[PDB]
């Protein structure tokens, strides 16, 4: 008595979760997932890949994944496949429907309906009104209970968008969530989790990293985790992070080299390691031309691969630029500086860029004039930053040393301008 | 197990609402003071009374809630009534009234069979899978992925995997705090709810916080609903933020009429009088002292009702202290200072305090010795802040004086120079 769609809308699977919310870009999202899947966290994999291929218009190839998934489901979670396939089947249902295939869609809505009548609880249904009655309860509890409350109102609106009550709920919840951001007492469930799964070494590295964030336990946690599963890339990846943060670049570079052997095209890996080489450069400078030249070479090769993979996910041009700068490569430096200006930029960052480039003009190039354009355009940007305040100090310096020579006319404007900002603040 | 199956019913007993609360009193208060401001209400309450052994007391609200639901939703009584029944059943189980328990479960099973969807099922393994997926998309799906594993634990608590999920979701939400759009949902909800003035005030507070229409919204809601406390209370916050506290105070006074003794109201109005007490001081060209004191008198009385009601929700001793201090009624200032020290406090707060007190001890009280102790202790604390400096600084002045007239102070210079030693090496970095 109803559109085959309306019925498909009620199935639980990837199509009915809402995974593209706020994803401006399907290529971005495709790369973001393909790069993350190279870390072997299972069959949920094949479903996520299917969902994408469908979105890429490759429906044919999507079935290819759904199929490999229900093979994994049958072999490993084998004794009980009926409930484990619920989403895989509903993904089939949706893929076929987009292929205009009414016949198999119907098959799978059947394999679903069956397993659903067989394991249905006589205790709990599904409801917008249930999710809502709960969201109000949590809201009236308040505190960390309001984040769970937002989801509640979200879940009630997916089914029935535009409702007045559920929308009240969402709005109040959200306002509270923006005003008083929730506390993540993660350190606990990480502990509970490690208790439950000692074998899983990834969990240990997260305890180890969050401890160091809230500062002996950590170092041992990572060493156990590195000891048991050196190969597992989630472990190497996040271990390396651990050491970069403890100012141990060699340990991190070593780790990430190892992970790269497993998946040598991973962009997150090239980015990470490039950054670690960059961390060694500064450290070395703090504590030699061939080494800087060779090291700077490394960071550059790696960051280039990330920038080439996906310019939006790997915003790495500033760094490549300041890096080509150290190596006295001034042409490359330019190329990458001019590339950062074309892209989107938080006023905050656009400032840091004007400063960075300004200094590059001021010290590397002979052009103080160019430097001035940026400190100025950088300071006109209304963001309270140490960077604005650093570019001020510099423009006062240059305007003064100018009136030193000729009491010149242009400076008398910059000088006043600046003095107009100091008087206000206070 | 009877309980194993009572986990399968959606009711406050399975919402795990006490997660992160280590005091039941603080909880019952937060809730009770917000209930001075509904079927949802009676159930929440029923849950409270139960939580305090008063189970016949809980059954009461439940009967009332049910009665109320039949009026609001007579046609939907059986579907609205789900949550209530699941409470009934749990309450009875905790009273050992097994036979009445079977009755409310028997009602729930019938309703569920009647209304079950043939396409979807609620399952902890279907929440877990979704959680893993959202986890793998990352980003904003992270908070949504936490709930998924949580939802899986309430249904199936103690599982290795579901907790693994929850661990990781939670690590990442800490690392990368989700973005929070609230401006859209509010306009969308105001349009959909033209009679709920509260939303309008909320939107106004979010606008002004992004700086007009701010005042437009508030004034409409005020004239549409001059008796709704949610509205009066949030409008007052608006006007304080606006800096025009005087209107704030007037609103709060109005809300107080409806609820004489609300600790939240009192704390809020109290803080307002205090904001005026500052403002008055800045002009300083005549008001006078006889006026400060009329105002200090007002704030102190309202903050005191909150302190009395709660010493944990209303952490208002540091404020009371420096309020009697300005007053010159030092004896009282002692009390609130003594109480503040003997309480859990942040290292940074315990500096401010060492400071606020150090100053007190120097200027009004004339004990130079005592201040010295605190500036010392507040600088010994391993924290970095503006107050530590203002504090190292007062020990600079007072050290120099001892040099000019003991030699003890020479060591106050040593530690001083010794401290600022390491510090400059950081600024250069």
Curated annotation (Swiss-Prot), chain B:
GO terms for molecular function: RNA binding. It is found in: Cytoplasm; Endoplasmic reticulum. GO terms for biological process: antiviral innate immune response; apoptotic mitochondrial changes; defense response to virus; negative regulation of protein binding; positive regulation of apoptotic process; response to virus. Gene3D superfamilies: Tetratricopeptide repeat domain. It holds the Pfam family TPR_8. Induction: By type I interferons, dsRNAs and viruses. Keywords: Acetylation, Antiviral defense, Apoptosis, Cytoplasm, Endoplasmic reticulum, Immunity, Innate immunity, Repeat, RNA-binding, TPR repeat. InterPro entries: TPR-like_helical_dom_sf (IPR011990), TPR_rpt (IPR019734). Domain-swapped homodimer. Component of an interferon-dependent multiprotein complex, at least composed of IFIT1, IFIT2 and IFIT3. Interacts with IFIT1 and IFIT3. Interacts with STING1/MITA and disrupts its interaction with MAVS or TBK1. Interacts with EIF3E and EIF3C. IFN-induced antiviral protein which inhibits expression of viral messenger RNAs lacking 2'-O-methylation of the 5' cap. The ribose 2'-O-methylation would provide a molecular signature to distinguish between self and non-self mRNAs by the host during viral infection. Viruses evolved several ways to evade this restriction system such as encoding their own 2'-O-methylase for their mRNAs or by stealing host cap containing the 2'-O-methylation (cap snatching mechanism). Binds AU-rich viral RNAs, with or without 5' triphosphorylation, RNA-binding is required for antiviral activity. The C-terminal part folds into a super-helical structure and has an extensively positively-charged nucleotide-binding channel on its inner surface. This is Interferon-induced protein with tetratricopeptide repeats 2. It comes from Homo sapiens (Human). The gene is IFIT2.
